[PDB]
Amino acid sequence: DDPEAVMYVCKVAAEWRSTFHKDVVVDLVCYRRNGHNEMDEPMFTQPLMYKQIRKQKPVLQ
Amino acid sequence: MSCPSTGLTEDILTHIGNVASSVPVENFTIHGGLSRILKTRGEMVKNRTVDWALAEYM
Fold first, then answer.
1. DSSP per residue, B8-56
2. Residues A47, B33: C-beta atoms closer than 8 Å
3. Do B34 and A44 touch (CB under 8 A)?
């Protein structure tokens, strides 16, 4: 939800791969706005998570 | 070797259907779309017909 740290982490990982020639893992913690499919109802199993979701602004805004 | 018949008497089937087409705890709220599904289950159960989901309960 903070893009300016995502950019820095990606840059650092790209430098690490060139400097040490090892694997590196980058984990992006986010959420899923819709259901698993476009025609899907996610409220059947995760009611409160999606009640919280529909009160949150998109990152672009 | 032989196998007994697997049928059941009707009252058992009706009791299972009635339990399967409802929510048997008090104070429990459920989604609208799920309420329609349970109501349709009752629709079928009162007409003496089973869909695929009701046979698994029975």
1. --HHHHHHHHHHHTS--STT----HHHHHHHHHHHHHHHTT---HHHHH
2. no
3. yes
